[PDB]
C-alpha cells in the first residue's frame, strides 16, 4: 500500500495505488554418502563372531 501527497495544477492528481504480488518457492536438495564395505557388515550383524 503506497502513500499519496497533494499538489497544485496543472499537475494531474495522483490517485492511491496498490500492488499485488506472489513468488514461487524455489527448491533445492542435498546429498551425502557414507559407504561401509564387506567386513564391517559382518561385525555389526555377527557372521564372523
Amino acid at each position: 500500500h503506497q502513500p499519496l501527497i497533494a499538489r497544485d495544477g496543472p499537475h494531474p492528481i495522483e490517485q492511491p495505488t496498490h500492488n499485488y504480488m506472489t513468488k514461487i518457492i524455489d527448491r533445492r536438495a542435498l546429498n551425502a554418502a557414507f559407504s561401509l564395505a564387506t567386513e564391517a557388515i559382518a561385525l555389526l550383524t555377527g557372521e564372523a563372531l
Partner: protein, 49 residues
C-alpha cells in the same frame, strides 16, 4: 445474497475504503510540507548574490 459470501464481499468493500481513505487524508500533511518548500524557494535568493 442471504449467504455468508454476500456478507463477506462487503468486508472487502469496506476495507477497500479504509485502505484508501487514510491514503488520501494522509496526502494533505505530506503536502503541507510540500507547499512550504515551494514557497520558500520563491522567497529565497541564492547565497552568491
Amino acid at each position: 445474497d442471504g449467504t455468508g459470501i454476500g456478507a463477506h464481499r462487503q468486508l472487502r468493500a469496506i476495507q477497500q475504503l479504509a485502505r484508501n481513505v487514510q491514503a488520501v487524508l494522509g496526502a494533505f500533511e505530506r503536502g503541507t510540507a510540500d507547499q512550504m518548500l515551494h514557497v520558500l524557494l520563491e522567497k529565497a535568493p541564492p547565497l552568491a548574490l
